[PDB]
Amino acid sequence: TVTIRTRKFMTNRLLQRKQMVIDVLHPGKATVPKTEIREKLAKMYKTTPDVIFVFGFRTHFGGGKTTGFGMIYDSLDYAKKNEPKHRLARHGLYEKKKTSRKQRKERKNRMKKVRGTAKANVGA
Amino acid sequence: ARGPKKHLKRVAAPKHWMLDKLTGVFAPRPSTGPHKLRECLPLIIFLRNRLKYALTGDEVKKICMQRFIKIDGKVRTDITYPAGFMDVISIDKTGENFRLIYDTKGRFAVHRITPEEAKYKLCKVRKIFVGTKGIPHLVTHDARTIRYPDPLIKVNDTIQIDLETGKITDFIKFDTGNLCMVTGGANLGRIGVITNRERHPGSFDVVHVKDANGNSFATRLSNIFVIGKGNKPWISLPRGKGIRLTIAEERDKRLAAKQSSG
Amino acid sequence: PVARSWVCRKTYVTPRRPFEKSRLDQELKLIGEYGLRNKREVWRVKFTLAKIRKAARELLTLDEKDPRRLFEGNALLRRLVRIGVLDEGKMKLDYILGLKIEDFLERRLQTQVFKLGLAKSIHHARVLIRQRHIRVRKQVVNIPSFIVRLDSQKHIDFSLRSPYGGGRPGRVKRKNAKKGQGGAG
RNA sequence: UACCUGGUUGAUCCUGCCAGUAGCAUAUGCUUGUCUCAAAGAUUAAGCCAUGCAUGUCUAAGUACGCACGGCCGGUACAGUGAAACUGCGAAUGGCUCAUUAAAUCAGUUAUGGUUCCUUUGGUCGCUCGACUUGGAUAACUGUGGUAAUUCU
RNA sequence: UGGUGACUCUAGAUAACCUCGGGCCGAUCGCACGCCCGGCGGCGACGACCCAUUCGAACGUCUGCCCUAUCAACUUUCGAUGGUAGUCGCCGUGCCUACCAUGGUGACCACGGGUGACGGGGAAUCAGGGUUCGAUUCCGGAGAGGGAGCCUGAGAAACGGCUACCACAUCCAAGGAAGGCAGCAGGCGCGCAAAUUACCCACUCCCGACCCGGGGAGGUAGUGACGAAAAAUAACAAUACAGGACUCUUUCGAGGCCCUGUAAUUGGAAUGAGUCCACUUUAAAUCCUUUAACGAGGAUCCAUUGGAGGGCAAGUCUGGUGCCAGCAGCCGCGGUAAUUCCAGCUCCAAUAGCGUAUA
RNA sequence: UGCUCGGCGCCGGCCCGAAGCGUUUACUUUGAAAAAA
């Protein structure tokens, strides 16, 4: 029912990955999730569904055709090496600190207020 | 201001960089280099637009700093390095090389070249200098000071140097009847043969260059880059051969390609 | 210093005389006959025709056998042919000054659907365009002020999601069925 | 669209102005369902400011004896991560405003053969005819204090 | 030797100088580790007097700026004009010193004054020719209350650097300390007049010893009828009934099938705002799009804003006060028959927009 | 518009190209350089 056709296929060895744009055809249905097209592209390219990253999926008027951008890596270490941190956090492979900019700024000003070893003591 | 500027806006960029408008407020100001700021092409725009190997600013750094890009033989680790006219870019991993040459319009174009041709770079001499102990110096357009040149090299000639040695191999004298191409100005990238040159004392000299189709024109002397002897070139020409088609005939061949594509 | 555009132009134009009999007469006649909403779109059609007329006057001001004159003369004539309002045999530069508002309004999507015979009235055609029922080459269009090109004239049909062209029945049909088996059982 | 109309007289023809007509951008009034863009303390006060933020910085390559953690066989000093501090760099960029300024600023064209230039790039760096590594001061640290307070000492 | 259109140019030769507040001629640090017989070796990092190059800056040449005569002579040894020799300056020159003659500009508008004057790229209007504005995102210039002076640094007369004055102003045990939002938010004043004491460095760049850190530069969201673009408030029949279209009854009547139009009789073809699951977008959401289940008959899921004598579209309608109240941009309406006032019915204008005042 | 150098061709020579000169302005026509939006 739901088919995947791709275009603009290019392979670069300088990033150890292959990237392409993905066209999804799902007539009379809601827009597809990322996990289903990830495992479908995993079945298409004979790759484990853990180094495939997809993002930026928009919907045309009518909903017959949806486009998006994806990429296929070569191993998990290359995907952990050169990728944005937010997309790895979306895949759950990275966690970011839950501190706001504000309290960090008064913390930085409070260590700027005092001089010596007590900078680490006043930072709490 | 109180010092040198460090920022560049998007609309203040030169048009041959030819990038967009709404996707950002600041533009990549190139680092200090051999070429001037107006006609140079920094590596980040070329990598993320002409080849589309990267998408973001940090991805260009993750391309560049790992000793994967060789500009004029040596490796460059700066994303804003100005790669100007007549420079070779080497991709050792993928396996092709590029030469930065002007297209028939006022912009740079990608040129796939064979690797064994990518061992020499043409340089245009700017001035002749004598060192502190009678040492002749040969200052080129890319600020590459060459010591002990041939005595036959005059002020406005061109030389062919070797990249891995930095030494002179061949040269072409500047006279009537040589294949020249125009760098800079409103006229840009045209391929023609020099016909005559006048001399103006105290003013800019102007030459007259005839196109291979007979469409003669005239540019200033400082915008002159001779590349060939007679009509046989040395470097590989790009598509269109710098012929400057007036708008009707490339409209006609665009329509012709429209029915030929189907 | 933001990354904005600030590029916008007016599409319609307000006439000099506010109240007059005859101008209101054929303006109301065009609105009633072509199923238009109000006078803003007929004023913007007048403004587009004024732009094309000004370009034609400027191009005929220039002398013969100038490459710019031939260049956007061929460009303007090719664009007007590709719209489909101009006939193929009238391939001349000075024929631009000889067509009117209803020629431009003939290539509207609303009246094209009305002349295709798949709609009853012109207002019914406007409602049926407005309510997502007609696709233009596998692309649904919900707006009536769509300039149908000559190449896309033979590819106008109902949407596949519409109940008229074959699909699921509408909301009031299933509600009527639910009321039918509610009253029957 | 290269466009007019009412008004001095008992009635006519004129100069002439007043008032209608359309756009533009400021305030304000009434009103208001969807959606894409988008201006926004400038006209008076370049008037006064409480608060919080806006400039910081380490690699394989300048200083590591803070056990703050931490690897072993400790024995030819230093495995390694490393707060702090010394050192070099930038803080003269960016951002806001139009008060002053009338050949002043600025625009196009010219010259530095009348000067300077952080940094990048290329060259120069055994071109001079006469120690197999020198010296003492200060940080950080420990300890001792005064002030009503300070990025004070 | 070499070059310019042109050097007192570059280079060459000779004689010396060469500042203790001092020009250079490496006492620096990592990676991989070896050959020959203790010396000898690759790839780098940092620093350095010099040249050229690059970003520039700086002083100059020619041409071009609003109004004003109730501004016709102005400037001068307290230097305005040129010459000679100097000081300082990174060079050039009254920039400044000592000496010389009185010079230089002006009716082709100097000098003086005002500007509700930052300049330009531009914006509105527009037959042609023109008028007005430009604080405002790009470029350049100036300043951080106003003058003045200065350290460091290559680059500052710097103000999120310092010093002194006056104005303003914080704390105090009264001896003394600490100040500059014409930055991002916010408050007061002012005025007719102008928004959140929000989130993020993910996108675009910038700075640093530099993949890794930071950035109210910026991006995102909210407020937002400044303004611009698209675009809902309805469509489809049989009968409540008036006539035209092809043919007749001298004339009423008829076939009238396309009919055409209007009034709250009937049931359907429906989809959208909103309520919402999900998916998608995104640093994370929200906005848009897709998609389940809901969701319209007087489809109360109710469209206003100004007018109806002339300009100028549009009632000699009805009722009331009757030169009063008032209307009216201008003519003029109001006196107990108001085509203008005050309220209902109908109608026209533009329409999610319309009216008024200012330039 | 003409008067000291050497070019396309022929046996001290004809032509062609000239180092250098070839009386002043406005006007008109062709080129260059003329930031982006």
Side-chain angles (χ1 to χ4, degrees), chain B residues 122-160:
Chain B
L122 295 163
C123 288
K124 160 175 171 171
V125 64
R126 174 165 290 114
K127 73 194 294 180
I128 318 292
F129 182 76
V130 171
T132 182
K133 276 179 184 176
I135 318 293
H137 294 296
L138 187 65
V139 178
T140 58
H141 86 290
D142 62 331
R144 213 194 296 262
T145 314
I146 299 177
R147 188 180 66 187
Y148 288 144
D150 204 49
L152 289 178
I153 316 293
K154 299 288 96 176
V155 188
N156 204 339
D157 297 328
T158 44
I159 51 175
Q160 173 207 49

Side-chain angles (χ1 to χ4, degrees), chain C residues 15-20 23:
Chain C
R16 178 68 179 272
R17 301 301 215 199
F19 317 103
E20 190 276 331
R23 192 265 315 279

Side-chain angles (χ1 to χ4, degrees), chain A residues 73-118:
Chain A
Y73 265 77
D74 285 321
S75 77
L76 183 63
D77 73 359
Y78 293 120
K80 286 152 159 283
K81 191 184 289 183
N82 62 6
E83 264 287 309
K85 303 168 191 293
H86 65 87
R87 186 177 296 114
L88 298 172
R90 276 191 218 161
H91 270 189
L93 275 80
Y94 174 66
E95 171 284 345
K96 58 177 303 177
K97 309 306 152 281
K98 274 89 178 173
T99 79
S100 70
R101 291 178 70 241
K102 194 55 74 73
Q103 50 201 46
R104 193 153 34 193
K105 280 172 178 300
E106 292 84 4
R107 266 174 40 83
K108 187 251 288 181
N109 277 110
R110 276 183 267 100
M111 324 202 186
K112 208 165 65 68
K113 197 67 67 70
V114 71
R115 198 219 187 201
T117 311

Side-chain angles (χ1 to χ4, degrees), chain C residues 1-3 6 8-12 19 21 24 28 37-40 43-44 108 120-121 123-124 126-127 130-133 143-145 161 163-164 168-176 178:
Chain C
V2 301
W6 315 293
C8 52
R9 67 180 65 251
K10 196 185 280 281
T11 309
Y12 74 102
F19 317 103
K21 299 289 94 175
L24 283 183
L28 204 60
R37 174 158 56 84
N38 51 3
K39 303 221 165 295
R40 180 162 298 153
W43 287 350
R44 94 195 160 197
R108 215 171 154 95
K120 300 295 179 66
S121 78
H123 307 267
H124 166 256
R126 190 195 166 88
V127 167
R130 198 47 194 147
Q131 194 194 129
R132 284 149 66 93
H133 292 108
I143 49 174
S145 64
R161 278 295 277 202
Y164 308 128
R168 195 174 54 153
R171 188 192 89 195
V172 290
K173 183 67 179 294
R174 55 193 89 154
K175 185 90 170 305
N176 190 21
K178 280 176 156 251

Side-chain angles (χ1 to χ4, degrees), chain B residues 171-184:
Chain B
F171 75 105
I172 289 166
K173 283 301 292 280
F174 164 67
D175 44 345
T176 286
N178 305 314
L179 207 71
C180 172
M181 183 278 288
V182 186
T183 64

